[PDB]
Amino acid sequence: FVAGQAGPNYPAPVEAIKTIQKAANFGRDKALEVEAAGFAKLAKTSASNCLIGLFLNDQELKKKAKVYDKIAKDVKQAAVLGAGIMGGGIAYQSASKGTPILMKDINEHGIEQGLAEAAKLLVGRVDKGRMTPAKMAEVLNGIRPTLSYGDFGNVDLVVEAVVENPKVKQAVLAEVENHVREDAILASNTSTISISLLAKALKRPENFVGMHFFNPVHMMPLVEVIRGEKSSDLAVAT
Amino acid sequence: MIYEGKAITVTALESGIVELKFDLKGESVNKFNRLTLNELRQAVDAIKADASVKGVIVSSGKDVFIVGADITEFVENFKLPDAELIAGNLEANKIFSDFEDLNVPTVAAINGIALGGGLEMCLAADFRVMADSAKIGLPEVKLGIYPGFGGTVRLPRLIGVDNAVEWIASGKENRAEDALKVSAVDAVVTADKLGAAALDLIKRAISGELDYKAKRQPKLEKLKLNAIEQMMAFETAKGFVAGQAGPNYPAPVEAIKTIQKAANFGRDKALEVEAAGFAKLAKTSASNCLIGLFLNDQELKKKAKVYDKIAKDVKQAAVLGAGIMGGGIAYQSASKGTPILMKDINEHGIEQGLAEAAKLLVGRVDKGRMTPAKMAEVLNGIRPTLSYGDFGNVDLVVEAVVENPKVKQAVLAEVENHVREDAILASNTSTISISLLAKALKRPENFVGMHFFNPVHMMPLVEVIRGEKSSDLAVATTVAYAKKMGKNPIVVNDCPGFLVNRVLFPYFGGFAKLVSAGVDFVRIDKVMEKFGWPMGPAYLMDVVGIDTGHHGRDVMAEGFPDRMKDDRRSAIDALYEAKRLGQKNGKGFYAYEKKLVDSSVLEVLKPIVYEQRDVTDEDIINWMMIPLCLETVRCLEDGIVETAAEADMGLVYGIGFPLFRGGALRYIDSIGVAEFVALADQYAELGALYHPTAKLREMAKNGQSFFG
Ligand SMILES: NC(=O)c1ccc[n+]([C@@H]2O[C@H](COP(=O)([O-])OP(=O)(O)OC[C@H]3O[C@@H](n4cnc5c(N)ncnc54)[C@H](O)[C@@H]3O)[C@@H](O)[C@H]2O)c1
Ligand SMILES: NC(=O)c1ccc[n+]([C@@H]2O[C@H](COP(=O)([O-])OP(=O)(O)OC[C@H]3O[C@@H](n4cnc5c(N)ncnc54)[C@H](O)[C@@H]3O)[C@@H](O)[C@H]2O)c1
Ligand SMILES: CCCCCCCCOCCOCCOCCOCCOCCO
Ligand SMILES: CCCCCCCCOCCOCCOCCOCCOCCO
Ligand SMILES: [Zn+2]
């Protein structure tokens, strides 16, 4: 079982089993010897020090994390432009982690897809005992569909996830900017367009950055926060 | 063909198999009216005479299988003398029995709805094949009666006492799935294979593969149950049904008594027991009042069609204010397939609204009554907000803000500039004038009242209030929207207290006069509860809240000084001034920990007890009922409501008027207009609330009635 799940490239799991199997009929002291021998062996493997190196990387990232947090402004209210694949995925994630978010779009159909998917995921978890019906309620109530900017007044960070078109993005980005606080951060989820290019359509580029997620938003761990030439440390940190 | 009528046809098929099909030409459904019964007699005799017949398949040519006859004939039939009624039923049952005694296999092919007589026809056959989309059941109890064509005889012998009782005492429709599990039916197939399944089954009966005689036998003999098991089954059935239907509903218990009396009998004797009980029930006052409710509903449905001719469907709705009513309205709207915006002024307000919508949805899922996926659809339907940014395409906006004229007039005027100029605006107000609120608007023709009752998801009634400027379109649209939300709307012209509250207070007045007369309030509502009221006056006042009743009284007193203004302090004043606000407050007439009698109230009420007048239970009922009934009559005469049906159903849905009594106006009809007027005068000393109207006295003499 462990073999077909860890893979041939991960010695640790199988060795632990081999150690317990070798010590099966032994008392404490002999069983410890079997443990020690296998331990020494693993500690010298390439898989082990590369895994330990990931841990060291994480530590480094956490130190930079503390620096970012010294200035990062908490996002109490978020907003995402565009529902659907990425937009809806972003809404789901934000709401799922304790951050109310507005799901803006241009037509009812767009909001349908967004809400539909957020539902399938939430329902899926409850249909698997991994989530409380009450929790599913909290998440959904966190997502607030809309087709206007009437409630953007107190949004701290807006994520633009519209069609991959420079002209379109520059228009929308410029538009939303006139509907949020002037200290609100704006971000684009674009994967092939220049953040510094998009920022030129704005009057407050210092607050514009890239927040690149990966499909499916709820699955992929990575988010590339892109710093444009004008992107302020605050915009990035936040 | 073997037989060709206007309701039934008997066409020969292969291998001697014959098909008796129901298709009432010219009508939309099949039903056992006089014509069909007569033709069934002939069809049966024709088959009984054709020695070449090897089997019979009973089918339908309509979308339904067979439903009940027109309520109209029920009314007529039940006017006949017991001897005639019973003789007529003996004759009908003879037809079904003769079909059941055919010395040939029989199968009923249930394609659609088969209710009452329709199901009874099916029970008469040897086998029953049902389409997975069809439904069957015996709704007789709804009319205050019970199965009259062998239903109480065949169903118990086919699916067992417990299950037969459950079907008959509830009158519920049963889906194919459930019908197969209790064996009311023998097979369930898709609509496209119903014909082939019936044909296949019949052949297997003819070949002897299926012993149709053995399958028929059970309904021709006594039940299989022990004397001991019978006692257990019947006594628990009576016990359970008793504390659930109430003492005022004979039908459910009689059906059980009938099955118990016939337990050891074969078909014919069991039919006799059934017939006798049936005749008895058909003459009860409960039955014709229940049947009258049905007639009222039919009237409402005809007005429904007229409203729908112009009513604009509400694709997108909006409610101003979350919280108790606002959130409740949002929940309902979203729960019935209509997206709705929940607007408020502060996040806390939206919290409460969303919180409650959640508790309800979660509650249903936490009891397998709702799918987690469905709960998602509902919640996504409610869209919280604090601006009017999305109101652009709203078709109807319901205002459910604080009870303050100033506030409402401001908000209403504000939203009007954020919606289409053809959007309907409605207020959920219970004590403010719709025509007054409409003056703050520039498009009053589109303003009406849409009055819901707490808790919005529980209360069936919705009073659509027409202001003096309210257009028929505005009213029609609001009506249809209420129906879509699963409510029962009744149009009422603007007036203090509208229809429901305006009628309730004269009722509470009488209660106030009783308490001021030294009558024990615990005895009072015990009497009114026995009368049929869900809750007694005192207890109801608590649930509603003394503070609420205090305010209401003031509004009505201002509204109709000539009869609702009292120049003496009542128990309401004593409890309010004493801060005994009701159930919510923890103390009112009773004490709540839940409902308890606490003598500490005696002191509070003492100052109110003027005389120590002695009274009978019958007087108590009249002190309460006469004011309520007369005020209803006034509403009809004032034109607050157009028809008696509307007024009575308004009280049935919004006040919980005892169903077996039909309504306030129908109650007067039961007592007798002349008799009621006479009765009223007897209490003329109590005030203007007990004074009959000229129009009433007039119809009292002309032998006129509200429904007769
Ligand atoms: N292949 C992927 O799935 C993927 C991976 C990474 C990054 N991205 C990025 O995500 C963005 C596209 O997201 P998508 O995959 O959901 O595409 P999509 O077409 O499925 O979604 C676009 C949504 O935005 C809505 N929209 C359009 N104009 C709008 C406006 N002015 N305001 C608000 N909503 C508007 C549309 O109606 C639609 O619902 C692009 O920037 C793309 O580079 C996509
Ligand atoms: N007993 C009842 O609960 C009942 C029964 C029938 C009808 N009504 C009617 O319902 C209305 C009151 O409803 P309620 O009992 O839920 O009151 P409530 O106090 O429980 O809720 C009022 C909500 O409206 C919000 N609000 C206040 N001003 C607002 C504005 N200008 N715009 C938008 N939202 C605003 C408040 O913040 C609050 O969330 C009244 O008109 C009353 O007559 C109440
Ligand atoms: C035989 C057992 C009956 C069971 C009791 C249930 C009651 C069912 O009876 C229904 C009869 O309804 C009578 C109404 O007929 C009036 C026709 O209305 C005219 C409107 O036409 C619309 C047709 O869709
Ligand atoms: C002053 C505030 C007003 C409060 C009034 C509410 C008090 C009423 O409470 C009673 C609960 O109402 C129950 C409604 O009963 C439902 C009706 O049953 C439907 C059957 O209709 C037959 C149709 O054929
Ligand atoms: Zn007072």
From Swiss-Prot, chain B:
Protein residues bound to NAD(+): 325, 344, 401-403, 408, 430, 454
Keywords of this entry: Fatty acid metabolism, Isomerase, Lipid degradation, Lipid metabolism, Lyase, Multifunctional enzyme, NAD, Oxidoreductase
Catalytic site positions: 451 (for 3-hydroxyacyl-coa dehydrogenase activity)
Family per record: In the N-terminal section; belongs to the enoyl-CoA hydratase/isomerase family.
InterPro entries on file: 3-OHacyl-CoA_DH_CS, 3-OHacyl-CoA_DH_NAD-bd, 3HC_DH_C, 6-PGluconate_DH-like_C_sf, ClpP/crotonase-like_dom_sf, Enoyl-CoA_hyd/isom_CS, Enoyl-CoA_hydra/iso, FA_oxidation_alpha_subunit
Pathway field: Lipid metabolism; fatty acid beta-oxidation
PROSITE patterns: 3HCDH, ENOYL_COA_HYDRATASE
GO molecular function per UniProt: 3-hydroxybutyryl-CoA epimerase activity; delta(3)-delta(2)-enoyl-CoA isomerase activity; enoyl-CoA hydratase activity; long-chain-3-hydroxyacyl-CoA dehydrogenase activity; NAD+ binding
EC number(s) per entry: 4.2.1.17, 5.1.2.3, 5.3.3.8, 1.1.1.35
Region described as Enoyl-CoA hydratase/isomerase: 1-190
Protein name, entry field: Fatty acid oxidation complex subunit alpha
Subunit structure, as described in the record: Heterotetramer of two alpha chains (FadB) and two beta chains (FadA).
Record-marked site positions (Important for catalytic activity): 120, 140
Ranges where the record places region 3-hydroxyacyl-CoA dehydrogenase: 312-708
GO cellular component term of the entry, any: fatty acid beta-oxidation multienzyme complex
Organism: Pseudomonas fragi
Biological processes annotated in GO: fatty acid beta-oxidation
Keyword NAD attached: yes
